[PDB]
Amino acid sequence: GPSGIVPQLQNIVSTVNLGCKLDLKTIALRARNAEYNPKRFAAVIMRIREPRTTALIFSSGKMVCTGAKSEEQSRLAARKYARVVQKLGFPAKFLDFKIQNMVGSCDVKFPIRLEGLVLTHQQFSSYEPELFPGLIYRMIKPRIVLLIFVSGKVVLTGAKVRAEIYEAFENIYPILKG
DNA sequence: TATCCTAACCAAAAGATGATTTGATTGAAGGGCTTAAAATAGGTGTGACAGTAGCTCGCTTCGGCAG
């Protein structure tokens, strides 16, 4: 069962369609937090402090946001960006919001011998300290990928909802323990 | 005496014992990646694709007579 350590999400990724054509130069010109360098890439970057997120605009009518601590918070950040775009004069809308990715991390408070983890589970766990100290572990139920380290801390990524990260942690905990 | 030994000591060669200064090492931080995923958005170059690029028979010529 659980050890009292609940995995905590550190990032969310989400996108939404603005539903209208936009001009990147106009956004960069009229907005304070907007960043635009067409010589490098054809998109505008947006930053706000509450939520603590980073997002982008594209002329084809697309918006992406990331950096939030929860999917509801990511939606709030996206809607704030949509409001900013609307008040800048574009006829934007908040259409087809989708959560794309969310990351989590946890710990077990005991060492994990990665040698044992690889030599019992070589079929889906890949271990290669030289380029990456941690052990890389992919899984099917749910479609998640993990990073397991010597200290016992684990990073979880690829989920759409916190339930997936929780159940992934519960699935791996008996493997981590023994 | 004129000098040498070497108790005790001055001057110096050298031999040693410790205190201070400076060359060398490294502790931690400036820093700056990392694979794992997930995503929208994009620009074009270029590199494959293809194409062309030791012995025994047969055959020929130009005179030397024929007609």
Residues whose CB is below 7 A of strand B: A 11, 13, 15, 41-43, 56, 58-60, 62, 64, 100-101, 103, 126, 131-132, 134, 136, 143-145, 147, 155, 157-158
Calculated CA dihedral for residues A116, A117, A118, A123, nearest 10 degrees = 140
φ, ψ for residue A75, nearest 5 deg: -65, -40
For strand B, the positions having any atom within 7 A of a protein Cβ are 34-43
Experimental method: cryo-EM
φ, ψ for residue A169, nearest 5 deg: -60, -45
- Radius of gyration, alpha carbons of chain A: 20
In angstroms, the CA A110 to CA A147 distance is 15
Stated in angstroms to one decimal place, the resolution of this structure is: 3.4
